[PDB]
From a paper:
As in case of CALHM4, data of CALHM6 shows a heterogeneous distribution of decameric and undecameric channels, but in this case with a prevalence of the former amounting to 60% of the classified particles. Both assemblies of CALHM6 contain subunits with equivalent conformations, which are better defined in the smaller oligomers. Unlike CALHM4, there is no dimerization of CALHM6 channels and the C-terminal region following the cytoplasmic helix CTH instead appears to engage in intramolecular interactions with the outside of the cytoplasmic rim for most of its length. Although the general organization of the CALHM6 channel closely resembles CALHM4, it shows a distinctly different state of the pore. Whereas in the cylindrical pore conformation of CALHM4, TM1 tightly interacts with TM3, which is a part of a densely packed outer rim of the pore consisting of TM2-4, the helix has dissociated from its interaction site and instead moved towards the symmetry axis to alter the pore geometry in the conical conformation of CALHM6. In a superposition of the subunits, similar conformations are observed for α-helices TM2 and 4 and the C-terminal helix CTH and larger differences in the interacting helices TM1 and 3. These differences are most pronounced for TM1, which in CALHM6 has detached from TM3 and moved by 60° towards the pore axis around a hinge located upstream of a conserved phenylalanine at the end of TM1. As a consequence of the disruption of its interaction with TM1, the intracellular halve of TM3 tilts away from the pore axis by 30° around a pivot located close to a conserved proline residue (P115 in CALHM4), which probably destabilizes the helix.
Author numbering:
A (entry chain A), B (entry chain B), C (entry chain C), D (entry chain K), E (entry chain J), F (entry chain I), ...: 20 to 82, 94 to 282
The structure:
Amino acid sequence: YGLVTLLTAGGERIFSAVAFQCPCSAAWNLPYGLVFLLVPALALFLLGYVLSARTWRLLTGCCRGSLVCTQISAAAALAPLTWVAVALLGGAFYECAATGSAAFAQRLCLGRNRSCAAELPLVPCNQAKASDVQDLLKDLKAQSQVLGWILIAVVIIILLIFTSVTRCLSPVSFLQLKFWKIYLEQEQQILKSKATEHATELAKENIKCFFEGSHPKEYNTPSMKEWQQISSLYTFNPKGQYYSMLHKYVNR
Amino acid sequence: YGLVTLLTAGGERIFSAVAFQCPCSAAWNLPYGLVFLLVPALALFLLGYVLSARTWRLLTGCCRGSLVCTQISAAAALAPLTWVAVALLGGAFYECAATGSAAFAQRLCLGRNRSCAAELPLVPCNQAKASDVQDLLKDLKAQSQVLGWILIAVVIIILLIFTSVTRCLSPVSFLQLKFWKIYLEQEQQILKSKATEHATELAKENIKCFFEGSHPKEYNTPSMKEWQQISSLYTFNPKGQYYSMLHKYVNR
Amino acid sequence: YGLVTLLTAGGERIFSAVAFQCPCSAAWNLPYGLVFLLVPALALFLLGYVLSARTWRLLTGCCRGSLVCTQISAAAALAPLTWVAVALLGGAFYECAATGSAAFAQRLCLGRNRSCAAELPLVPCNQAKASDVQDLLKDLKAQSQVLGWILIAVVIIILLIFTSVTRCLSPVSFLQLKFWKIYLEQEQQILKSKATEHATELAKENIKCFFEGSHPKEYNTPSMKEWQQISSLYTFNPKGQYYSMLHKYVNR
Amino acid sequence: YGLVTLLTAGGERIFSAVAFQCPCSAAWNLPYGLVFLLVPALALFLLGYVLSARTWRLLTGCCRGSLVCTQISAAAALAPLTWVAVALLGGAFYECAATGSAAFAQRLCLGRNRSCAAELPLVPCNQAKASDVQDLLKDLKAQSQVLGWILIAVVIIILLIFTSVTRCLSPVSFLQLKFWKIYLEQEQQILKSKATEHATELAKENIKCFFEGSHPKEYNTPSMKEWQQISSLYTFNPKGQYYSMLHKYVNR
Amino acid sequence: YGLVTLLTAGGERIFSAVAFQCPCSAAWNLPYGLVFLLVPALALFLLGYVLSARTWRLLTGCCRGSLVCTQISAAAALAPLTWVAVALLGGAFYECAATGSAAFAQRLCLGRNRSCAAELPLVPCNQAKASDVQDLLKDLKAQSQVLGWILIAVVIIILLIFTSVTRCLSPVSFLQLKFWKIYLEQEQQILKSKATEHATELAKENIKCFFEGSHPKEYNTPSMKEWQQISSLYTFNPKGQYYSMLHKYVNR
Amino acid sequence: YGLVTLLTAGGERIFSAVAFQCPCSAAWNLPYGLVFLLVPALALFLLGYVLSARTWRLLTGCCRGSLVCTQISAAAALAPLTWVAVALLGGAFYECAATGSAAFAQRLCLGRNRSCAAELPLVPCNQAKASDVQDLLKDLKAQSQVLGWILIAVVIIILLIFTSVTRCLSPVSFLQLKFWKIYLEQEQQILKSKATEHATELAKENIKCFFEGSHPKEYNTPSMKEWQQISSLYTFNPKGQYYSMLHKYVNR
Amino acid sequence: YGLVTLLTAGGERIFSAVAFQCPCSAAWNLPYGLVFLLVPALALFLLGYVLSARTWRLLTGCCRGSLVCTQISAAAALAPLTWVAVALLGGAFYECAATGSAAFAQRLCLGRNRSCAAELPLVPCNQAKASDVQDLLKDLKAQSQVLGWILIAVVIIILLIFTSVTRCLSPVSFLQLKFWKIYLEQEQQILKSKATEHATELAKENIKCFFEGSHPKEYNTPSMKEWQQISSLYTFNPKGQYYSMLHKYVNR
Amino acid sequence: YGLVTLLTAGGERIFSAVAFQCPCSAAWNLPYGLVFLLVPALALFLLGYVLSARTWRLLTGCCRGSLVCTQISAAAALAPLTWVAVALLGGAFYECAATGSAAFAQRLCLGRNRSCAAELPLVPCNQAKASDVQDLLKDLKAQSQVLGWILIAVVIIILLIFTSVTRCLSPVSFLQLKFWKIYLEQEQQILKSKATEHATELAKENIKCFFEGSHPKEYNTPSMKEWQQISSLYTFNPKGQYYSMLHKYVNR
């Protein structure tokens, strides 16, 4: 129960701390909204850019490259766009971003109170009492939510076009591509299991030879150059089907 | 319990954020309603346009085509129409769409207050106090719900006509069409299972040959050109019944 | 629990949205009631017209016909009449339909307030304060419920006459008709099961021949023309009892 | 139940005691915030600097060294930065750090009340009633949260660059590095188990010889110089793959 | 349930009795705080100084000695420092220690009320009403908590330096030291078990000889001088590895 | 449930009866506090002096003796000191003991009201309204709690010195003393069991001889003089290790 | 549930009836307290004097005797003293016994109101309003509780001295006395069991002989004079150890 | 559940009906208390006088006799005395018996109001308002409870003397008397069982002979004169031990 209690206490403290006041300030407010917009989005973007093993496969070993790079970048930027869309649909962040540069304010307000730019930042702060801005905060909330929805539409549209073109111009058919992906999945799982047990037997043999203090068996050597040879990325040629470059490397 | 708590917290935050205020604004309100109408509808339409594997079957491989295209487009536009119908029956969105172009307003209001177009947008906002518009908001809600019901009738009618004609002019009978669909289902499931285990054995053999470092077996080759040959779409000719083009490709 | 919570939230939202206000409007109210009367009724009528496989049996294959058509139409119009009866017994819809054409109003009200047609639509809206109409709304509710009960009587009467005549003039006896229906039920279930397993074996054989890449077995061919031949509808002649046209087609 | 009750009582007492008042004091407040910033951060930094066995491996035995040292220092400073980021996002600590050196105050306040530096420390204390500082506390809270978010961005960026470069310039490939780490894991677990049972048998033999009072068996001797020889750190040379220096020491 | 009820009643009585009032007294208050500071700390220090069996091993038998003594003293003073740190972070004790010697008071208060030393002791007592001291109590609470945090930092720093130096200059490597500690653990457990059963058999034999009234067996004698010989402490020499002096005493 | 209900009722009655009012009386109050101090302490002291079987071993049989006597007296006075310490830390008892002899009062009060000794006993009674004594009761509570803490420190210190010296000057080593105590424990348990079954067989034989009415078996006689011989206390001589005097008595 | 309900109802009625009002009466109150003091104490004393089988062993058979008589009397008066101590610590009874003989009152009250003896009995009755006695009731409660505690100390002291002397001058040692008591326990249990089954077989034989109507077996006769012979009490002589007089009677 | 509900309803009705009002009446009240005193006591006395089978053993058969009669009468009057003691300790009954004969009243009241006998019966009725009797009711309650306690002491004393004398002058010893009572218990249980099965076999034989309609077996006859012979009561003579007169009747 200790873990449960500590986790609930930590979560409550965390959320009470992420309380979003949108401080009404003449000039220090814009960055307040801007960081709450960009930084968590950038964070999730980075985590996506990190997590996928496909890019790591390319990166290791002392560092056409455009296609794979834009593919991985989009496949990772999927999620941060979802976060920023959800936040922008939250409305609070952009509502705080209302002020921004003075150009936005001067172009923005209808000029009714003639005192917009002076103490506009008070408008999400609810401290200003001019009727014009008390209605204008609502319109700004609207612009935030609307922009968010427009973004979540643009992102799905881009995903459509991306996946469709990537699915349109490939030489291989569909019912084989599905089977190929199943193949790669099975290969990954089999590799995990058998490499695990092979490393296990290697360790067992070596540690027994250490306790005894004698020569090892010298059963076989997984060649490191071979490892690099099978780490190739592209895995296609119309003639030599040979998926999974390891499999391509069975002729010699 | 952590997943459960995080999911309920996220759902509550999400729904509190999708709170729909319908900001009363002279000109920025129309798009507010318009995005809440179109964008989620377009989203679900796109997801339908993506999900079905029948269209993907046509799309892959470097891209009569009308019939299949309108069939898939309608079969996917089924759901977005359901969303937009439910929303329009919600009444709030179109109620916010009341203003729209000025032509709608000038033609719309009875001319009683003579001040409609000035601050009509306040009518779902409940801030306007003219009796005429306080009753007119109700009629607009009515028009929304009624239009929604009319749409959900038109959509079912269209579905009827579509499925009836598609069921009327086909050469094959009913009790055979049912059996054929059962056939295709069984074929899909069998294909999934056996292709899975065949890829499994392929991977096993190749990974064993890799650990040993020797020549593979060369059992057999699923031909890629054969894969493309069996990916055909139409699957009918009165003479050569031969469902499931794979099955058609058993004579040679 | 996620499915349960989402379903209850959706149901609550749906029902809160189907809230029926009956907007009091001089001319736009009649259609408000009319759609809530007809459209859900038409919807359930259409779903009935779709669901029964007996009509589909007739429809497929490039399209005396009166008897079967009126039979299926009544057997499907059973349910929509139940919906419209329940709704009309609800009273709200027709109460909203009070206004209708002006002829209904002028003939309807006793002429007491002499101001009926002007703002009668307010009478279910409870905003009108003339004593005559405040009592007249009740009578309209009465007319709605009464008409509903009259309809639910007429529908059961029609069902009686229909099923009795259909049960009266048939040549076959009762205790055999029951057995015949049991027969058709058993035939349907047996057909489902055995056709399922036969398609299963067909698929197995063909997919094995594909993995191997060799000629199929050519066990037998369910003839498509035979399928159409056994799809006939009438299934009766006094001499050749031969229920279930498939069974009739065993002499040659 | 005694342990549970004592733990909940202790936790409640602990948290009630860590109550953070931010005493408003002219000069003794700055250190109040500074210790609550640095000391828990330094504590978690130290615990990280202690816990990892990789550094201990280097440290023991009477004490190129730069690379490993910066690697371990960053890998341990990961967590304290997370603590300080969470705290700075809490806002209270830095809000208490508002005062700091007088330079911060004189540069900070807009000069409105002209009495900032006199009793500014009261501003998180809520005792000062000047409007300027009552709004300025909010901006200070903002600066705290914003700086926190900037730090949590900088830390993830640094983690990215660190892990990417460390993953970029290594000679070995990826799919082999994963296998190598699995290898080291298996080696650690096998070592734990077998060393455990070997020490067990050693102890059993010696304690039996003690109860009897006779000469021991002298089965074998794990050489201490050998232990030191196998404690090496680098474990790489392009030619002699020989992971896990113990494994490198199997040729002689 | 009796034990449970008596324990909860005793705990409630105990805690209600340890209620800390900090009596405001001119001269008798300082010791009030001082005992609540030192005595529980000294108590836990003593319990640590008692509990560890390593020191007892040295102490028994009619009583270089510096190194082991400072090691055990620090290893035992670990916990009392934790208690005193937690208490000092509680703030109440030192807040009561505010008064102390008059030098602390005269140097302490800003000289505002000019009546500090007269009735300062009332300041945690909340009975004094001078504004200066009502704010000064807060600063004293601050000094308490801050000093506590400084102490909990100094203690962890000292622990770091201690364990690092003790881990730095030892001749044996790490991966062998871990194994050695595992060895000593296994030896302790084996000793417990086998000594237990050996004493059991000894007692059985002697008590049987008593019931019968005859001569004992005289199986063997665990020599007391041998016991003292195997009780040695240092257990290291670079040449004769021979951990666990018992094990060192197997050559003769 | 009857036992449970009677026990809870008895406990509630008991505790409601041990309600401590500290009657404010000029001369009869001192003994009121004194008995509540000494008598329960003396009671637990006596129970300790009774319970230990080591002293009984010395006492029986018609009654160097200093060492064992002070050892047992301290080992039994352990607990009463804990009771009196807990009570004195309760504060109420000594607070009632405030009055005591007049010397304590005259030396005690600052002489402010000049009416201390007259009606000081009212000070824990809360009936006196002089400000001096209303503050003095608090200081007396302080003196009680402080004295209690001083006592609980002195007792642990004495326990330390006692157990350390007793552990310091003994000739036998530690790791043998532990084994010896385990030995005595096992001997006690074995003695309990086997003496039990031997008395059981004795009783069985004699009662069978009684039912039959014949001569007994005369198997053996546990000699009473032997019993006294094996009841000796010291159990040590450097030469004849011979723990557990019974065991010492196996040579003849 | 009937037994449970009747028992709780009876207990509630019983306790509501034992409500102790201490009627304030000039002369009839003293006996009111005196009976509530003595009678339940005498009752429990008598029950103790009855229950122990050791005295019954002496009493039966037509009735040095001092030692056993004082031993049994003290061993039985143990409990009544506990009851009277608990009651006297309750305070109510003796508080009611305040009045007693007039000598107690005249010596008791300080002579302040000069009207003590007239209506002192009202003092626990709370009806008298003289300040002196309203404080004097408290002192009387004190005297009651204090006397109770003094008694519970005297009783434990007496128990100590009694059991110590009885344990001091006995000729037999301790470790044999424990074994002897275990012996007597086992003898009692064995006697219970075997006498039970022997009476069972006797009854079986006789009742079978009755149903048949024939001569009995005449197996054996437990001699009544033998029964009396084995009922002796002292069970000790230094020479003939022979515990449990039955066992002493095995020589002839 | 029906039995449970009916029992609780009956119990509630019964107890609500046994509500004891003690009607304040000048002359009809005395019997009100007297019946509530004697009648339930007499009832339980009678039930005791009935239940014991020892007296029935004497009574049957056409009706020294003093000793057994007083023994049974006391053994049965045990319980009614307990009831009357509990009731008298209840106080209400005797409080109602306050009035009694006028002699009790005239001797009873102090003569203060000079109006005792007129409307004294109102004193437990709480309707009289004279201070003297409002205090006198309390004293009467006291006399009731005290008399009850005196009675419960006298009864236990009498039980003591009775059982002691009956245990003192008997010729047989204790340890044989216990065995004898065990014997009689076993004899009763064996008699129950075997007589049961013997009557069972008798009935079986006779009812079989009835169904068949033939002569019975005539196995044996339990003689009625024998039954009377074995029903004797005294069961003792010093010479012929022969407990359980049935057992005495085994010589002839």
